Amino acid sequence: AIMTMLADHAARQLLDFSQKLDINLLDNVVNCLYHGEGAQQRMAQEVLTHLKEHPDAWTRVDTQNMNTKYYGLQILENVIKTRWKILPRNQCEGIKKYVVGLIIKTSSDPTCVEKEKVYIGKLNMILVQILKQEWPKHWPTFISDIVGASRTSESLCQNNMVILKLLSEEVITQVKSKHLKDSMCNEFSQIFQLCQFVMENSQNAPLVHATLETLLRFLNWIPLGYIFETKLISTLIYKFLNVPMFRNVSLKCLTEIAGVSVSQYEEQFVTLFTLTMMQLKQMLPLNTNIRLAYSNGKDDEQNFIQNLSLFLCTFLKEHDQLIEKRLNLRETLMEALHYMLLVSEVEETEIFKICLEYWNHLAAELYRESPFSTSASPHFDVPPRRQLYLPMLFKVRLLMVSRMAKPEEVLVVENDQGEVVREFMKDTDSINLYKNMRETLVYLTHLDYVDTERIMTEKLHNQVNGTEWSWKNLNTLCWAIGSISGAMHEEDEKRFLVTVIKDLLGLCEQKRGKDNKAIIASNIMYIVGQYPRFLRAHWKFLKTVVNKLFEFMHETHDGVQDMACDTFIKIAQKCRRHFVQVQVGEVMPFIDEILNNINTIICDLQPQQVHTFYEAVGYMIGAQTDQTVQEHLIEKYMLLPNQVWDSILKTNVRACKAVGHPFVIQLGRIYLDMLNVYKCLSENISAAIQANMVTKQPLIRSMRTVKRETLKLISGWVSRSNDPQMVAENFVPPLLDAVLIDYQRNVPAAEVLSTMAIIVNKLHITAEIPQIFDAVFECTLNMINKDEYPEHRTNFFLLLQAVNSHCFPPTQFKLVLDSIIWAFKHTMRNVADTGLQILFTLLQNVAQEEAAAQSFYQTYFCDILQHIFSVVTNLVEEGKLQEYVANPAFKEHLRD
């Protein structure tokens, strides 16, 4: 292992001696690749060599040559970003000239193509990294320079097309970009002219591909005169559309042309459409099934189709009106529409959203034209716009129904082998797919609910029959109905919906096994959830449904019950008014029936699934008034868990936030005991520390948790209450002795402050200020104004904020203001902006009164200005400073 030392000592000396040798450099970079230890040691050596300085790199390139090319290019590229601002502009521009020269040299060589242009690519990247920082205020002529230098050779020009592409990659706002266009237009016209030359004169395919690429990218910015006033359109139509080599890069261009807003040019757009169709019908046959061809379609073959959709969407969205207008064009537009409908059948994530993007718009427009549905047979005046697309609308309804995605609501998914199970690989992409299809289908359903009804009914009969019955085949349909929620009118919606429900129940009756039952239950649940307006119309129907839910929460197959609880909440939320009352069909209230059958239902559910259930029931019972009756019902509701408390609290506060304000009937009977025992626990803790780090003990935390959960409960009820009159006079007074004195009696080591901050918004807090801002103020700043305690900082400032804003001894006030100013000096946002608001309302309070209008000016006003002065970066002028300070428009003046 002696040679290792020699090799190690060899490399270190050559770097600091300013004399570089090529062969020795070559040996090492190969050694690292072909050795184990060599890799690590030589890499460390490489960062060590890179740290020094560049000077050797360029002359290393000047004089193996490809690996060290990657190396030296790493050197240069890295040193550039670092010292581009440090170095003088002329020297770095010298390095730039060196880069340009190297580029021209190596691109002008034929062997570069045999070198496969990796070195060319990296070199280009260097040029990019330089150009990125240089361009704005160093090279105003760069454009014209490359344009000029591309007029001699092929390799040069095409490599400069690559450069222009990369420049388009390294070049926010509408207006500023429009100023960009107007400022750069003069320099753009040349860039268009070059490509204009190459497209008409060249023979080289690899050059032309890059040319149409870069012209595609730059098209958006190049002036309109060079586009529609020339033969560029016709040129792209006849010459570069037919040829396969360009078939998928040409289309894009045309798409980009369609996206231009018609101003002075109208006809040329019609010509564009007519000719694009004329050539597309030849390129692709009308009879051809797009889906199958796309399936067997190669990597290149797909881009043509995706671009077909992209083009058709992009053009129609802008000028479909212009095409409609003429009578001749009407047929061609029908044909093109047929094409798009065909392309809309490709089973792929991207293309679907691409053509859907059209479908949406289409439905939208002719819906905003005529909101009313066409016919109901159970006389002209047909909407003009509708008339045109008329025999092509029903196809979209037939299509949209059968193809929509899984809702965010349901949790049922089939695996490729055919297994049913819930899964949540959930990205908002598919969800937005869902919602967009939903909106579209509603737009289309508003055009004729009759056709929609028939379309769904037919497939439903085919499903009851069993013909072509697969879980997916029903899933799609049910999801489709669940998106029609509120499309048809009441009297029709009933008549249509009842059939769907009955046949659905029958379909659940026929199907056997858990594999079917899970799917059917899922579909039926979602399809029920979306129709509260129907269920509130018919009582016994709703009864049947909710009973089917309760019966479905007895299911063993995972995912189903968890969904059924969600559906239950979704029904409770909107049908809260139909549950309590005694209905015409049933003598006993449904809630009353539930409260005694709950024990058998909730045994199969998960605990988390039970909490939601309790919240739902609470939302049901919280709807009734009827004076004492609902209170009695609440008593019955909570009588089971609450009874064992007198002779856990988490579920209690769950029910508290769930039911709402009318929690007083249960809150009151257990209220005083809480204070009575809390008064003892507080003394337990305080005496525990007084005779001893006890806060670290488990028992003390366990005793303080009670103290917290007691306060948070009052926080909840008061936050959700609507009777300040009762709160302020009844529940508020029993806090002075039990809570306020507790903070004083308890040790600093052992949520009390942040809780009382809320009631200020609700209630009457002024008369308690001397009691509140006493024990928990001056003796607490010793814990929070010393620098510490991330919890307390999100509490006190809020209380001070509310108290200072809602209703406006000195020793207790100074320390307040000093705290306000202390707020925006932090690094935490929630402890900073608070003081901004508090101070903003502070100066806006004492300035509106009569008595203390000058006591805040002379004593504090000029003494506060000095503090805010350091955090920045009308009272003196109005006679309610210019020397003391020096010794929207106002914001821009200070920031500048």
PDB file of N, CA and C in Angstrom, residues 25 29 174 221 228 254 266 307 368 374 403 484 552 888:
ATOM      1  N   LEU A  25      -3.677  14.820 -15.485  1.00  0.00           N
ATOM      2  CA  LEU A  25      -5.061  15.150 -15.180  1.00  0.00           C
ATOM      3  C   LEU A  25      -5.968  14.049 -15.721  1.00  0.00           C
ATOM      4  N   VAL A  29      -9.021  11.151 -13.370  1.00  0.00           N
ATOM      5  CA  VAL A  29     -10.462  11.086 -13.594  1.00  0.00           C
ATOM      6  C   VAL A  29     -10.900   9.712 -14.098  1.00  0.00           C
ATOM      7  N   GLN A 174     -49.023  40.318 -16.751  1.00  0.00           N
ATOM      8  CA  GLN A 174     -49.566  40.623 -18.073  1.00  0.00           C
ATOM      9  C   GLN A 174     -48.945  41.883 -18.676  1.00  0.00           C
ATOM     10  N   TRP A 221     -44.717  35.880 -29.126  1.00  0.00           N
ATOM     11  CA  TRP A 221     -44.185  37.224 -28.929  1.00  0.00           C
ATOM     12  C   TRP A 221     -43.960  37.976 -30.239  1.00  0.00           C
ATOM     13  N   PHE A 228     -50.429  36.595 -40.022  1.00  0.00           N
ATOM     14  CA  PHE A 228     -51.646  36.452 -40.813  1.00  0.00           C
ATOM     15  C   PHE A 228     -51.588  37.251 -42.112  1.00  0.00           C
ATOM     16  N   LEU A 254     -49.853  25.459 -35.073  1.00  0.00           N
ATOM     17  CA  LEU A 254     -51.198  25.838 -35.486  1.00  0.00           C
ATOM     18  C   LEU A 254     -52.086  26.114 -34.277  1.00  0.00           C
ATOM     19  N   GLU A 266     -59.914  38.148 -39.547  1.00  0.00           N
ATOM     20  CA  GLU A 266     -61.005  37.223 -39.275  1.00  0.00           C
ATOM     21  C   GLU A 266     -60.981  36.097 -40.292  1.00  0.00           C
ATOM     22  N   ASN A 307     -52.302  16.462 -29.604  1.00  0.00           N
ATOM     23  CA  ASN A 307     -52.263  17.763 -30.260  1.00  0.00           C
ATOM     24  C   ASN A 307     -53.498  18.043 -31.113  1.00  0.00           C
ATOM     25  N   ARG A 368     -75.834  29.396 -21.094  1.00  0.00           N
ATOM     26  CA  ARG A 368     -76.014  30.814 -20.811  1.00  0.00           C
ATOM     27  C   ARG A 368     -76.827  31.466 -21.918  1.00  0.00           C
ATOM     28  N   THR A 374     -85.255  22.143 -23.673  1.00  0.00           N
ATOM     29  CA  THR A 374     -85.882  22.117 -25.009  1.00  0.00           C
ATOM     30  C   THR A 374     -87.329  21.661 -25.032  1.00  0.00           C
ATOM     31  N   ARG A 403     -68.563   8.059 -17.954  1.00  0.00           N
ATOM     32  CA  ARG A 403     -67.121   8.224 -17.830  1.00  0.00           C
ATOM     33  C   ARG A 403     -66.631   9.089 -16.675  1.00  0.00           C
ATOM     34  N   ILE A 484     -76.280  15.101 -10.644  1.00  0.00           N
ATOM     35  CA  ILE A 484     -77.435  15.752 -11.256  1.00  0.00           C
ATOM     36  C   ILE A 484     -78.257  16.461 -10.171  1.00  0.00           C
ATOM     37  N   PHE A 552     -76.876  -0.756   7.465  1.00  0.00           N
ATOM     38  CA  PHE A 552     -75.613  -0.899   6.742  1.00  0.00           C
ATOM     39  C   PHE A 552     -74.392  -0.632   7.618  1.00  0.00           C
ATOM     40  N   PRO A 888     -51.110  54.878   0.636  1.00  0.00           N
ATOM     41  CA  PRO A 888     -50.433  54.111  -0.402  1.00  0.00           C
ATOM     42  C   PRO A 888     -49.171  54.823  -0.878  1.00  0.00           C
TER      43      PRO A 888
END
